[PDB]
Every structure is written in structure tokens, then in C-alpha cells.
């Protein structure tokens, strides 16, 4: 889709003029080939000397490490859009990455808010071979310590794999694994039978978007948005950053990147808060978006992902407000009726 993306950016995106920068819509998709991509990037930086070009990728994550390293070498900001190949990369070196992804911490936070709202206390934290997921486990433990989130514990863990996963049960499950490794887990779960309507699986991490009947994954808001909106958002971010740096002497070029570290200066000091397309689009030092907009996609029997709940400004609005948890959808759940009698039942 690289050729299609370039065509969709040259024709449509060029005519787009969101909004100061001398030439806003100046850019070029320029086709995977790290050597050619870096060489072309240096050529444009030396000649164009633009204040940054929005990058769009379609591959489902090695591109991000190279892009940030190139940005640090060039000492120029390069925003990442079109989620995919730009998933977090929490560690950073001085550089200005400004990626538009969603970190695991917020994804875990939104999921727990949904779980508490739906009265889904029981949960597990099954995980495959550790791709450096120690942070994810720690965050869950921190969130668990509270008033009601506490529930049954779990662990991290082919017939042996199926037995280990089925030895904790607890209905609700939390999964964190790569696509290449998650597939064997799904097959093992399917063989164990924990993939029907009797269980709900929350898959978080870089998955993005035999699948179990109940699947809930949290992804960044506007994931289904067209690439035209993505490029427009990236252009707006660059324009907002230029305006933010306009509060002082705005004629501060990067000297022409570095083609023929040394500067040791980032750009997050000035570019900290911007507002565009409503939502919460503000970048942090680590490169995330503080208080980002998130949605909770759900998988139905039609193999379709639909928005169930939206998170924005620490507000959780979700359709399908099932008051009852359907706890015994797999007994131990009783629907107890009653009536108000002051000596016996007092309701306030």
C-alpha cells in the first residue's frame, strides 16, 4: 500500500491547506527501503529545509526505532501518524519524536474503568513469553490496589499452554502478546474451550486492529478515520508547534539537519500543549499524548469492530449500558428481588 499511500498524499493532501509556515502543504510520501528512505530524507532536509514532514506507515514496528534515530541525527521533529509501525516506543534518547500512538498505561486505565463500570471484578493477567511486559504487570498491580478493583490473581504463561491458561479460569481475561505469539495462544484457548460466550478476553498492547466470542480491545480514537484526516492532523500539529515556537524569535532553523548529539537540544520545551479537532492532542516529554482520546472496540459474530465506549478528558461514555453483568453467562449468580420496607430494607 506504499504506492497507494503516496498517490493519496500527492494528489489529495497537496491541495489540503489547514492554515506562520511559508509553505504548509509542501511534502512528499517518497515510497520500505531504509537506505533509500534515509538518503531521500537527507536530500529533502538539505534542500527543502522544512520544519518537519508528517510520516505515515501501513506496516503492522521496526520502522519507529530507525525514524527516531534519524530524527535525532537530523535534530528535526517528525510526527508519526497512521497508527502502525509507530506504537509507543516508550524509551527515548535528546530528540523530538512526537508520535501519535497510545501507550499501554492509558489503555490499561481505560480498560479498568470499563471493568469497574460493568461490575467485572474477576480477572486474570495471562501473558505469553515476556516481550518486556514487566511494566504492564506492574501497572496492573498499581491499579489493582484500591477500593474494589481487587480480584483473583493470575500469572504469565500446545497442550501444556492450554492447561496453564485453563487452570485459573476467572472468566474475564487480560492478554498481552504479539500477533505471531498470540495466535498459538488463541488456538490453545480454542482447544481448551475458553473462547465462547462464557468468557470475555481483553487484548491490549500492540495488537491494534479462532477469535473468542467476547473480545474487547482499546485503540486510539479515530482509528477508522481516513488517511486524509490523519495527514491533516499531522500538518495541524506541525503548524501549532510552529505557532507555539512563535512566542519568541521564530527564525531558528536546524542548520540543515546533519548530513555532512552535537546540538544535544530537544524541542519539547516550547511544543507542549496544542488544540485542534477538539479532542485532547497534547504531547508529553516521552512522546505520548497526555490525556489522549481512546475508544473500546468490540468484536461481534460478524467479525466487525464497533465502538462501545469512548474515553476523553477523563470521561467514560459508553453505549450499551448493561446494568447487570450477566455474571453466569458461562451457578453462582442469583437475581434477587426485593422491596423497600424501612425496618428491613432501607434505600438511600
Amino acid at each position: 500500500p506504499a504506492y497507494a499511500a503516496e498517490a493519496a498524499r500527492l494528489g489529495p493532501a497537496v491541495a489540503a491547506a489547514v492554515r506562520g509556515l511559508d509553505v504548509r502543504p509542501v511534502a512528499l510520501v517518497l515510497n520500505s527501503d531504509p537506505r533509500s528512505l534515509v538518503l531521500q530524507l537527507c536530500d529533502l532536509l538539505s534542500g527543502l529545509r522544512v520544519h518537519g514532514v508528517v510520516f505515515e506507515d501501513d506496516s503492522r514496528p521496526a520502522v519507529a526505532p530507525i525514524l527516531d534515530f534519524l530524527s535525532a541525527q537530523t535534530s528535526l521533529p517528525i510526527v508519526a501518524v497512521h497508527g502502525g509501525a509507530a506504537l509507543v516506543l516508550t524509551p527515548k534518547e535528546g530528540s523530538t519524536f512526537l508520535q501519535l500512538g497510545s501507550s499501554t498505561e492509558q489503555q490499561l486505565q481505560v480498560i479498568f474503568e470499563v471493568l469497574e463500570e460493568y461490575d467485572w471484578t474477576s480477572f486474570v493477567a495471562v501473558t505469553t513469553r515476556a516481550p518486556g511486559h514487566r511494566a504492564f504487570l506492574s501497572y496492573i498491580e498499581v491499579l489493582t490496589d484500591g477500593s474494589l478493583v481487587g480480584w483473583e490473581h493470575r500469572g504469565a504463561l500446545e497442550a501444556v499452554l492450554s492447561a496453564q491458561l485453563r487452570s485459573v479460569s476467572a472468566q474475564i481475561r487480560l492478554l498481552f502478546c504479539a500477533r505471531e505469539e498470540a495466535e498459538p495462544v488463541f488456538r490453545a484457548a480454542e482447544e481448551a474451550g475458553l473462547t465462547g460466550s462464557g468468557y470475555v478476553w481483553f487484548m491490549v498492547g500492540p495488537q491494534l486492529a479462532p477469535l473468542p466470542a467476547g473480545l474487547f480491545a482499546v485503540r486510539s480514537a479515530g482509528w477508522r478515520d481516513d488517511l486524509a484526516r490523519r495527514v491533516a492532523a499531522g500538518v495541524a500539529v506541525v503548524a501549532r508547534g510552529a505557532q507555539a515556537l512563535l512566542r519568541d524569535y521564530g527564525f531558528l532553523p536546524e542548520l540543515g539537519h546533519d548530513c555532512r548529539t552535537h546540538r544535544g537540544e530537544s524541542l519539547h520545551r516550547y511544543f507542549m500543549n496544542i488544540t485542534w479537532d477538539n479532542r485532547d492532542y497534547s504531547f508529553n516529554e516521552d512522546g505520548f499524548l497526555v490525556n489522549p482520546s481512546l475508544v473500546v472496540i468490540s468484536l461481534t459474530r460478524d467479525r466487525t469492530w464497533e465502538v462501545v465506549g469512548s474515553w476523553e478528558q477523563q470521561t467514560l461514555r459508553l453505549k450499551y449500558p448493561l446494568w447487570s453483568r450477566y455474571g453466569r453467562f458461562l451457578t453462582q449468580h442469583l437475581t434477587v428481588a426485593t422491596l423497600e420496607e424501612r425496618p428491613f430494607v432501607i434505600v438511600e
Binding site: 534515509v38 530507525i66 534515530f69 524509551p91 534518547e93
Partner: protein, 443 residues
């Protein structure tokens, strides 16, 4: 250089699949050409793994380019903790222990010398944070607290504020970890503040000892250095031997040989990394090598160096599980032949008292600042201590009053019988104390 690489590759081939060999790489001042050079090398050579040993003063470009296509590489020089995590660098492996191991040995050394106290002077860089986290985890596993963990500021001067904070603390022991410039700056301030000597013991890493020893290292430090650090700079023979064994161990496919246009990743790359971890190169060259955790091997002995006689000396080595000190006596900063106590008594306790009528009366002082002295029922001086506390709940800022009563009388007796030096101080807000819940954090 090329000659050493050819010798190492030739030895690896003779050690004993199809024309197995490695091609050396030439570093460049700018990483842009470095990435291009490695990309051409990988496309042509298509070698399973790449060895990086550039002594710049950069391993980032090689590891970052190895990340694409999932081609694991081995680094032999860099020891920065940023490479320890495989989430960012999933194609980077090395044998030298990380700087977090320095924290592990420090804890072992601290436990050896019957020390339970520390003032962790750690730099604010990522390496410093990782060392603090590793040390804190080890201390937590032993139910031990670090006391003060006051941070630092890389590339900053006039850091006497942190030194003043550490000096007032009871414990007199500092485990310092920072860069050469930071170590020199802290050492100069410590020397000018009478902090290097008396009952102070310094523990520093390899970088701190070398840089500090160059500029301003006092003759009381206790640094740590790798047993074969210099050899590790030229021990590529072990790397080639381990890599050859890993390939000989193992349904595999040839790594991609095309760099100009490629998106597919190596399917067996993760498998090669998994087999490499399982590999146990027990040949014994430069010590036993065994990969630990992910990306590093925790099988290297650590030596201890001291600045006695204005020269680095060996005072023992680390066996891998327990230190083995058998060299000459350690010359501490004060010059004493015995290890100075790591903890200092603090006979200046500050006492908090709450206004209770039967026990602790509270009365305002007179104009001169000392409240009137009365006599007991049977006739005797009443012991009153000048206490400081809020006036109303009015200055409302530490109005000096005088306290007396049951508890204060008991306190005076305790101080006399055990040598206190008390300075009473009433509670800021009148309240005995209870566990309140704030922001979902009861404690």
C-alpha cells in the same frame, strides 16, 4: 581493524555452514554513513549476526538497523543500561554485564561488611535510574530501605545542596554512580566540604573511579572494575566461538540478503535468539560465559580497586556469588586500618507533642521569651521545655511556647538516662493521627 577481524574469523572457521565467515565493518563519524555501510554489508554478506566493538569515546546505529528484519547482533563494548531492555532493542545481545550488576555487587559487598545503611547518590540519566531501580529491588527483597535516594543533575554545577542534605543524615555511606564529568564535580565539592574522610566510605563504578581518579579522586575511594574489561575490548574470539556454536546447534531459513527494498522480517530470527540464549559456551576463555535474562550475560567476575598510595590497587575479586577479599588491607579515606562505621549516631532527636491537659500543658511564654517558673504542690521547681508550635491552628507560624507535664517530665528523665538532646515541637495540626484515604491511596 581488518587484520584482527580476519584472524578471528579464520580461527573461528578452523575451530569447527557453507563458507561460514564474517566481514568486518568500518565506523564513520556520522551514523548516516554507518547505517548505509551496514545496510550494504548485510545485503552482500547476509551474515547471521554482526559484531560491534567500536570504541567511539557508537553502537546505536548498528543495533537500530539490526532491529529491522529482526537480525540479532552482538555488542562487545557498550555497557549502557539502555540496551538491557529488549522492548526497544530486540535484536541486541552482549556478554559483558550491565551497570545494574554493579548495584548487585554493591549490595553483596554492603551485606559482607555488616552494613545496613546507604546514601544513594545517583545521577539523573537513564543509567543512573536503572541502577537505583536494581539496587532498590535487591534491598526490598531483603526488607532493607535505602534511606535517602536523592537524585542528581547531569551536566550541572554547584551541587552542594545535595551534599548538605546527605551530610545531615545519620548514615555515612554513599554509593555514587554517574559520568566522568559528574563524578569529578561531586568529588571536588566533597573535598571542599570535608566529606571525603573521617567515617565516610565511597563506593563508585568503573566509570566514576576512572574519571575521578584522572581529575580529583581522593585517596579514600573504593571503585569497581571488570576483571577483563580491556580484554573484553579484544575478546571477539569468544563471540565468534559462541555464534558458531549457536548456528551449529540448529528447520531454518537463510536470513534475507536484500537491503534495497524489503519489508519481510526473518521468521527464524526469534528462533535464533532463543537458541542463542539456551547456548552455554562453557569453553572457559576469559571466564565462563552464560547469557542471563535478556541481552546480557551475568557470568563475569568483578574486581575491586582502591586509591591507596595515590594508585589503583586490587583488594579482592568477585567469585560470582560472594566477594573474595584477600589482598592488602583497604586504606579508607581516614587512613584507619579498620573499616569505618557506616552509621553515625544522632543524639539530637526532635520530639512531637500534642496538647493534652493532664499530660502536656501548653502555656505562652513571657515577654523575655521564657515563661514563668512555678512550684509544685509540695514545693519544687517545675520542669518546662521551650516548645515551638502553631499559635491558633495570630501569627499561625511557630510561636515559641513552653510545655510541661507528665509526658514532658518523662521525656526529661529519658534524655538524662541515655544522653539525648531534645528540641520539643508541637504537631502542626492538632490531631492524634489516623489513616485517611486520598486519591485511592489509603497509606
Amino acid at each position: 581493524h581488518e587484520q584482527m577481524f580476519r584472524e578471528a574469523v579464520n580461527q573461528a572457521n578452523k575451530r569447527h555452514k557453507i563458507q561460514l565467515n564474517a566481514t568486518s565493518v568500518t565506523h564513520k563519524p556520522n551514523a548516516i554513513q554507518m547505517a548505509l555501510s551496514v545496510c550494504e554489508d548485510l545485503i552482500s554478506s547476509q551474515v547471521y549476526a554482526i559484531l560491534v566493538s567500536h570504541p567511539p569515546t557508537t553502537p546505536t546505529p548498528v543495533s537500530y538497523t539490526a532491529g529491522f528484519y529482526r537480525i540479532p547482533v552482538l555488542g562487545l563494548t557498550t555497557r549502557m543500561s539502555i540496551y538491557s531492555d529488549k522492548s526497544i532493542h530486540l535484536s541486541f545481545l552482549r556478554t559483558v554485564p550491565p551497570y545494574s550488576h554493579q548495584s548487585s555487587v554493591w549490595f553483596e559487598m554492603m551485606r559482607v561488611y555488616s552494613w545496613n545503611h546507604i546514601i544513594l547518590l545517583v545521577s539523573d540519566d537513564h543509567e543512573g535510574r536503572a541502577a537505583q531501580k536494581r539496587l532498590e529491588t535487591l534491598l526490598e527483597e531483603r526488607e532493607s530501605k535505602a534511606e535517602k535516594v536523592l537524585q542528581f543533575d547531569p551536566g550541572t554545577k554547584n551541587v552542594t545542596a545535595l551534599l548538605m542534605e546527605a551530610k545531615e543524615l545519620e548514615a555515612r555511606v554513599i554509593i555514587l554512580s554517574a559520568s566522568e564529568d559528574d563524578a569529578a564535580t561531586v568529588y571536588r565539592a566533597a573535598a571542599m566540604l570535608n566529606m571525603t574522610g573521617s567515617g565516610y566510605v565511597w563506593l563508585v563504578g568503573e566509570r566514576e573511579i576512572s574519571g575521578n581518579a584522572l581529575r580529583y579522586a581522593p585517596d579514600g575511594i573504593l571503585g569497581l572494575q571488570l576483571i577483563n574489561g580491556k580484554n573484553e575490548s579484544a575478546h571477539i574470539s569468544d563471540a565468534v566461538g559462541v555464534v558458531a556454536q549457536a548456528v551449529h546447534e540448529l528447520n531454518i531459513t537463510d536470513p534475507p540478503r536484500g537491503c534495497v527494498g524489503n519489508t519481510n522480517i526473518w521468521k527464524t530470527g526469534p528462533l535464533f535468539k532463543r537458541v542463542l540464549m539456551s547456548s552455554k559456551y562453557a569453553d572457559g576463555v576469559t571466564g565462563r560465559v552464560e547469557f542471563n535474562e535478556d541481552g546480557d550475560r551475568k557470568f563475569a567476575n568483578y574486581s575491586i580497586m582502591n586509591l591507596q598510595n595515590r594508585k589503583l590497587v586490587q583488594v579482592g575479586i568477585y567469585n560470582g556469588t560472594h566477594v573474595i577479599p584477600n589482598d592488602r588491607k583497604i586504606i579508607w579515606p581516614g587512613g584507619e586500618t579498620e573499616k569505618p562505621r557506616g552509621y553515625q549516631m544522632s543524639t539530637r532527636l526532635k520530639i512531637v507533642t500534642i496538647h493534652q491537659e493532664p499530660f502536656v500543658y501548653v502555656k505562652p511564654t513571657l515577654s523575655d521569651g521564657t515563661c514563668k517558673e512555678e512550684f509544685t504542690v509540695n514545693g519544687d521547681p517545675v520542669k518546662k521545655v521551650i516548645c515551638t508550635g502553631p499559635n491558633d491552628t495570630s501569627p499561625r507560624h511557630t510561636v515559641p511556647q513552653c510545655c510541661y507535664g507528665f509526658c514532658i517530665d518523662l521525656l526529661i528523665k529519658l534524655a538524662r538516662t541515655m544522653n539525648f538532646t531534645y528540641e520539643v515541637h508541637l504537631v502542626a495540626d492538632g490531631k492524634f493521627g489516623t489513616q485517611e484515604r486520598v486519591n485511592n491511596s489509603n497509606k
